[PDB]
């Protein structure tokens, strides 16, 4: 249920299904929490990335009580953490609000 | 690493809590201490400290480090 050109928020039940259907498109997941400074600062930039890279699916997961099980399995220590997946598996990761690093990781995933 | 290991700070680590440099930038690089603990778990429960190596120096002064910021000394 991902929408090209924007960021789609997922939960513990909708994440995997989207990943297991992205095909040749790399999936980026912004793992965040509502009350996190660097995460809030990054929000605008992440939104623009989704608009600039239409060949990439951008998602976001609120690592709260509800999605506790998914966050645990995906693995997150630093908030935010961006997971890059392709072929139903995690192939890249950028921890923290590192735009340049995230960009390089996305460009690495695209190529 | 193991508790009791002698180590030297081999990376630049500027701290502000040293008793003889209170609230002032002080680089611990070059100092030698003893590993006091390696933060991995709390009574069997994994924890996430990102500067897990606790090193003790003179005057009971202690600071936390990443494994790559310190080097074992024989």
């Amino acid at each position: 249920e991902a929408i090209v050109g924007k960021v789609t928020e997922v939960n513990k039940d909708t994440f995997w299904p989207i990943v297991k259907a992205a095909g040749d498109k790399p999936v980026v997941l912004d793992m965040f929490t509502q009350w996190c400074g660097p995460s809030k600062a990054m929000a605008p930039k992440y939104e623009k990335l989704a608009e600039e890279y239409l060949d990439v699916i951008f998602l976001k997961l609120d690592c709260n009580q509800e999605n506790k099980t998914l966050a645990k399995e995906l693995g997150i220590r630093v908030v935010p953490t961006f997971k890059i997946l392709k072929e139903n598996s995690v192939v890249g990761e950028v921890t923290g609000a590192k735009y340049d690093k995230l960009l390089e990781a996305i460009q690495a995933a695209r190529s | 690493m193991n508790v009791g290991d002698r180590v030297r700070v081999t990376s630049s680590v500027v701290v502000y809590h040293h008793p003889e440099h209170k609230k002032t930038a002080f680089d611990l690089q070059g100092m030698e201490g003893e590993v006091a603990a390696v933060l991995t778990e709390w009574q069997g429960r994994p924890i996430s400290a990102n500067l897990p190596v606790l090193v003790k120096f003179e005057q009971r002064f202690k600071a936390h480090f990443r494994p790559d910021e310190v080097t074992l000394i024989e």
């Binding site: 793992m31 929490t33 509502q34 009350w35 996190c36 400074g37 660097p38 995460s39 809030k40 600062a41 690592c63 966050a71 645990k72 997150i76 220590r77 630093v78 908030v79 953490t81 923290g96 | 680590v13 500027v14 701290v15 502000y16 809590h17 609230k23 933060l39 778990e41 709390w42 009574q43 429960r45 994994p46 924890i47 996430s48 400290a49 990102n50 500067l51 600071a63 936390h64």
Partner: protein, 110 residues
């Protein structure tokens, strides 16, 4: 809220105490204070809101991430961007934040 007020006052006082400053964008400052308050409320200690934990209770006992965390207390490094050093690009010139601002920012999240 009592906890929130105490947390805001703590942040303002700690910033002045450590010669650090709030983010030029106070919205960043506000969400971190609320996050700290929430943890203090539910856990008894203000665990950092910009870290994810597998065992919160264990973390509270270990205290590494109890605000001000070890990285901040020892190296003045605040990942949450609450206490920024006068050299950080996002660092502003304030060490105070209006309660009104905290309220507006929290409200914008709803």
């Amino acid at each position: 809220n009592k906890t929130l007020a105490a947390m805001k006052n703590f942040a303002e006082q700690y910033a002045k105490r450590t010669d650090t400053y709030f983010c030029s964008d106070l919205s960043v400052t506000a969400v971190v204070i609320e996050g700290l308050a929430r943890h203090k409320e539910e856990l008894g200690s203000p665990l950092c809101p910009c870290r994810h934990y597998e065992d919160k209770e264990a973390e509270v006992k270990n205290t590494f991430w109890n605000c001000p965390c070890v990285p901040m207390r020892e190296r003045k490094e605040c990942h949450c961007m609450l206490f920024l050093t006068p050299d950080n690009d996002f660092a502003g010139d304030a060490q105070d934040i209006p309660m009104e601002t905290l309220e507006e920012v929290k409200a914008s999240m709803a």
